[PDB]
Amino acid sequence: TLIGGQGDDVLFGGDDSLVDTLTGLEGSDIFILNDTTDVLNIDTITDFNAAEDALDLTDLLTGIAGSPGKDADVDAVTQFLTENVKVTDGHVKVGGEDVANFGSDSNFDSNGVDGVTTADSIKVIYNNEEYSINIDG
Ligand SMILES: [Ca+2]
Ligand SMILES: [Ca+2]
Ligand SMILES: [Ca+2]
Ligand SMILES: [Ca+2]
Ligand SMILES: [Ca+2]
Ligand SMILES: [Ca+2]
Ligand SMILES: [Ca+2]
Ligand SMILES: [Ca+2]
Numbered sequence: 001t002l003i004g005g006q007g008d009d010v011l012f013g014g015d016d017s018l019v020d021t022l023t024g025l026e027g028s029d030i031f032i033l034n035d036t037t038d039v040l041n042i043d044t045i046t047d048f049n050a051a052e053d054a055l056d057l058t059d060l061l062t063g064i065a066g067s068p069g070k071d072a073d074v075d076a077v078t079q080f081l082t083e084n085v086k087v088t089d090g091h092v093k094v095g096g097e098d099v100a101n102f103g104s105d106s107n108f109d110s111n112g113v114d115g116v117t118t119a120d121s122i123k124v125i126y127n128n129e130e131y132s133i134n135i136d137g
Contacts, residue, residue: 004029013043015059021103023047030125032056033099035063046103050110054123054130057085060094061126068126077126085124087135089116108135 002011003023012032013020022031023046031045033055048055061067064084068077086093089108093099110120121132 017041019043021046022100024049024053028052028054030054030056031100033060035060035094039097042098042100044101044103045106047105048100048102048108049106050108050120050122051112054125055092055099056125057092057094057099058126060099061085064095074129074131077129078131081124081126081131081133085133086137087122087133088137089135092122 001021002013004011004025004027006026008027009024009029010032011022011024011029013022013034015034017036017038018041020043022043024031025047031048031053033043036042061084068080084094090102090106091098108116108120108122110122116135118135118137121134124131124133
């Protein structure tokens with residue numbers, strides 16, 4: 001159980017084999033997630049707020065054949081992330097697998113209107129740069 005504070009934190013449970021519970025609290029927090037092979041070992045993010053927080057998914061994305069390398073620009077990265085990161089209300093998946101379990105204080109309404117729809121997006125970090133990926137369904 002790894003808890004931030006009211007500022008802008010960076011939270012990480014480790015490149016481990018165990019469930020951690022991650023809570024960002026106020027502020028715009030980055031949750032760094034590890035890729036596991038056992039989907040039962042993935043972390044819980046208790047309070048992801050899509051209008052503020054972000055997910056660093058580099059570790060889940062880098063081992064996909066053809067992932068963008070050191071010479072990629074932000075349009076190539078955007079195209080890759082669009083194809084590979086599936087964002088829905090309460091879920092984020094890579095390769096059909098959940099990156100994390102999102103807990104009951106999460107909110108995927110990034111824009112503050114219409115609840116959660118395809119107009120909403122999440123902030124995804126790949127190689128220390130940030131991208132907005134829309135809800136796709
Ligand atoms: Ca915080
Ligand atoms: Ca841990
Ligand atoms: Ca963990
Ligand atoms: Ca937060
Ligand atoms: Ca807030
Ligand atoms: Ca995995
Ligand atoms: Ca470079
Ligand atoms: Ca919305």
